[PDB]
Amino acid sequence: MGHIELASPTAHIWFLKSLPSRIGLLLDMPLRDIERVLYFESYVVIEGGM
């Protein structure tokens, strides 16, 4: 086998678009609100302090 070094991280469609949505339910974040971040049409804070 070989490999392709992606220039940006990319989500795995199996772990995102499956109905239980392991990415969605691991973060307790709804899939409708995750697809907005993956589509570059919304920001999400990442440890923005208290």
Partner 1 sequence: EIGRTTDPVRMYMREMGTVELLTREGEIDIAKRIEDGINQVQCSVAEYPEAITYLLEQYDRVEAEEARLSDLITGFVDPELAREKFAELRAQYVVTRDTIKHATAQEEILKLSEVFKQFRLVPKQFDYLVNSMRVMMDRVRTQERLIMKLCVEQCKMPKKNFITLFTGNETSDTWFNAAIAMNKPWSEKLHDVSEEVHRALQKLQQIEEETGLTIEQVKDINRRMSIGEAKARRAKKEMVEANLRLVISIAKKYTNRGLQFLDLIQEGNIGLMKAVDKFEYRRGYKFSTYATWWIRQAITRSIADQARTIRIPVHMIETINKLNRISRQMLQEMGREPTPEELAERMLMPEDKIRKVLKIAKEPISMETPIGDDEDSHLGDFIEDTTLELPLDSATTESLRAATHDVLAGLTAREAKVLRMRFGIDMNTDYTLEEVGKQFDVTRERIRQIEAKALRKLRHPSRSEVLRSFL
Partner 2 sequence: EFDAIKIALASPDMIRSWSFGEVKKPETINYRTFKP
Partner 3 sequence: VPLDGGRFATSDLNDLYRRVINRNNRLKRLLDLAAPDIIVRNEKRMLQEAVDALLDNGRRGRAITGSNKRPLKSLADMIKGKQGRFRQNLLGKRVDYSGR
Residues at the interface with partner 3 (CB under 8 A): 4-8, 10-14, 17, 38-40
CA distances from 23 to 13, 19, 27, 35 (A): 10, 11, 7, 11
C-alpha torsion sign, points 44, 25, 11, 1: positive
The stretch near partner 1 (CB under 8 A) out of 1-9, 19-27, 28-36 is 28-36
Q: Which does 36 bind (CB under 5 to 8 A by kind): partner 2, partner 1, partner 3, none?
A: partner 1
Select 28 or 41, whichever has its Cβ closest to partner 1.
41
